Amino acid sequence: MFEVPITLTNRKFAQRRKLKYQYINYISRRFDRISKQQKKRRRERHWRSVSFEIWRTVSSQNKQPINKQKMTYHNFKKIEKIPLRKMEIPLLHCTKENKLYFQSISRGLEPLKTSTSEVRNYRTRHIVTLTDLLHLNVSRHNWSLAYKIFATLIRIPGVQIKSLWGIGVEILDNLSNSSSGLDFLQWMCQIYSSKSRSIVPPFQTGSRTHTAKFAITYLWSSLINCQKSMLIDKISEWVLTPPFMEDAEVWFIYASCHLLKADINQVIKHIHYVRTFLKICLDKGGFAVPSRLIENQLKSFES
Amino acid sequence: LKYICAECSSKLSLSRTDAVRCKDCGHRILLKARTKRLVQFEAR
Amino acid sequence: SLLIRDLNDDLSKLQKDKVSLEDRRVIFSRLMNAFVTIQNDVNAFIDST
Amino acid sequence: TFIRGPICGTDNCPSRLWRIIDGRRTCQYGHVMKLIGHEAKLLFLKSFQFILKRQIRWLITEMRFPKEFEHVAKIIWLKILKTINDQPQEELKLQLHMTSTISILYLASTHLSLPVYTCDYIKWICTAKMPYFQASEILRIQLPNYYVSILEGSISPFNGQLYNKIALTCGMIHFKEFFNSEISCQGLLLKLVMQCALPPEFYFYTKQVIEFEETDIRNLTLWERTDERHTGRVSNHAELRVLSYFMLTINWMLSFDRDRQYPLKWILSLTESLTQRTTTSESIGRNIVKVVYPDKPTSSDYFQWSEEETLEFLKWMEKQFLPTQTDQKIARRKLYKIFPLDSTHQLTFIEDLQERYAKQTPFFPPARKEAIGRLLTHIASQLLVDFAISKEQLKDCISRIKNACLHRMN
Amino acid sequence: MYKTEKVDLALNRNRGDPITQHFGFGNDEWPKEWLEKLDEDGLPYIGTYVEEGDPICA
Ligand SMILES: [Zn+2]
Ligand SMILES: [Zn+2]
């Protein structure tokens, strides 16, 4: 009952995607007329936009006023009447279940059964159960079992690593042995920061433009591994290392390394240092304490 | 039988990626042993 | 050097024709800091003494 | 004395630099400064036959079969090989799907009267023990993708595809004169009583209803080569009828113990001892099969799984999914080996069988029909996953043969 | 006079790391004069005369 970490068993789902986006094309085409193939699916899905540190959204202003009803019964069935027969042609080529699916989604009914729920694969079905038990155990705080699941899973030759947050929070709550969550994360960044589609939303990403979740979370969580303190010049040595200039969050990580190292004229230079990086962190999309609070800690230091 | 166990003295041989240890003892320290081959000397 | 070139950048983005005096004290504080430590690094080279 | 590098600093070479320790560097002259087409029938049948003998190797070796099986297999695979090479067309028209491998294995086993049944095969292959789910598994040969598809396709046995393919082979070469296609019935009864926790009287009960409708004559062909069928022939794979009689027997027997030999309670306690998910090799296996069974609920069943079952599962995963399919590689063996992959307890088969036979050993009012029903439906569930058929398939059969007992009783 | 030298090709590896270098010969093309000093394991035959530049290890 959880997402599976495998490419979905194929044929019928793809030919259904065909029927769907093809009919979609015919209806929206005739709709723009009245307002006047993997590749067909491709163009179709294509022409469309593809007090705490909230990476805020884009709110409501500068957006256009209105519309008033476009679609009566007669007018809609006008748009619908013809593209449904065009569909009658290749429906004759697809399978009866697929045809039924086309009939029902085109009535507007939504199918009872998931792609997983109708999938049936023998190595893949076993991997489905494996991954499932991983997610279930991780939900169940069963970090021991869950760890066994994870190791046995990553063993298998089919799994590339979405599963990393599983192991980040996994080894995190594990505390047991193995070179830990931080080690894993900095490994992720060291292996996958160099040249050395379906599956991919944002929580796993490529390093052309922002790889987000895992990077920022090892960043902050490492600054909290300095909350353990009051290793740092290491963390900001390899936060110093990378150029991926649209961060600023590593500027606040940097200035936090200088506030943690500031806890004699050396300590002075560290306090002037954090004073600098807080403004070169006003460079970008701001992470702000009132920051006169930051400075007030810095005057408790100036003591 | 190229090697010898340093602890139990059992003569034994290895292979490609094999347990670098005595198959009897489990001691992990092995002495090399040496084979019919021509070395030439001058008797002086 | 880079760090002072930044202090010098924020320093010019005064008027303070408006602009409330005291920052004058803090800017000086940062400048003294920079001069002292560069002067130290030079001394150390000519001179670690 | 070589290093090749630094050509030669003399434009009538460049001939080839070795450095002496004295740093002259010296150059030789002496300055010192694809797949087959249209008859890959032969290769196809070779990867197929090779995969078969591979599986036989695993079952004499790892399952302690008899060596005679192999000869029985050369005979059956020989008969149908001779029949597909008594066929002309360059258009292949053969279907050597994996169901044919398992089909001739079961066929041969059943001639030899060995007490192995289809559910043994389903378990064996779904637990990756017996290699199955691949063409020449990841390690072989590059064939026309038309035949790799003729292998990878039709892989599942899980809607009775196995019963249908063994009957189909049983037509392809004839069961009757050539072989002895009587199933090993009574061992299936034992397997079944022990598979529940039924007291040993039900072996003789169901054995008797068996004798009552059949007088114990059980065939293998359901063949009239086609697709087409619509009456009489949901129920003539012997096994499925055995399970049908078994179910029926339990229902009748328990609902008409006017003696009151079987307590209103012990049917519940039987249901609960049957239901308690416990971690033996078997139940762990049935979980592994539950994972690749087509229909819900059985996947909701993986949802409701116990930590030891999952553990022995990952065990069987690292053991029998080394039977997987299809520099930087060792860099990922060390790379993954950077973070850890991570008096004999559980009991044997006749031990479990004994202990539920005892769990009911207290042997010596209309809502007990409920207990009968839930027990029958749990037993059904186990049979459905174990014998790779459908809910609707099973109940079609036991319905038909139940009317087949009422008809020869009324 | 006797001298003992220790050859330890785990000298570079970062602690319990994957092992890059294994005593023995590969299947690429290498001198062959090497087998005059070295046995199949990549260790030198006992008794061998060895002067500056010779192999003592492969
Ligand atoms: Zn020894
Ligand atoms: Zn030259």
PDB file of C-alpha atoms and ligand atoms in Angstrom, chain B residues 4-12 21-30, ligand 1:
ATOM      1  CA  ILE B   4      53.251 -23.260   4.932  1.00  0.00           C
ATOM      2  CA  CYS B   5      51.283 -22.333   8.011  1.00  0.00           C
ATOM      3  CA  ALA B   6      53.431 -20.457  10.540  1.00  0.00           C
ATOM      4  CA  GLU B   7      51.545 -21.909  13.514  1.00  0.00           C
ATOM      5  CA  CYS B   8      50.576 -25.539  12.778  1.00  0.00           C
ATOM      6  CA  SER B   9      52.989 -26.166   9.896  1.00  0.00           C
ATOM      7  CA  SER B  10      50.406 -27.702   7.584  1.00  0.00           C
ATOM      8  CA  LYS B  11      51.562 -27.438   3.969  1.00  0.00           C
ATOM      9  CA  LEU B  12      48.905 -25.833   1.783  1.00  0.00           C
ATOM     10  CA  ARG B  21      44.746 -18.201   6.232  1.00  0.00           C
ATOM     11  CA  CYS B  22      45.479 -21.781   7.275  1.00  0.00           C
ATOM     12  CA  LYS B  23      42.654 -24.127   6.299  1.00  0.00           C
ATOM     13  CA  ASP B  24      43.333 -26.050   9.533  1.00  0.00           C
ATOM     14  CA  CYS B  25      44.262 -23.385  12.135  1.00  0.00           C
ATOM     15  CA  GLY B  26      42.664 -20.232  10.862  1.00  0.00           C
ATOM     16  CA  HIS B  27      45.954 -18.511  11.521  1.00  0.00           C
ATOM     17  CA  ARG B  28      46.410 -15.687   9.089  1.00  0.00           C
ATOM     18  CA  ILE B  29      50.159 -15.844   8.669  1.00  0.00           C
ATOM     19  CA  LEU B  30      51.762 -18.002   5.947  1.00  0.00           C
TER      20      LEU B  30
HETATM   21 ZN    ZN F   1      47.468 -23.814  10.579  1.00  0.00          ZN
END
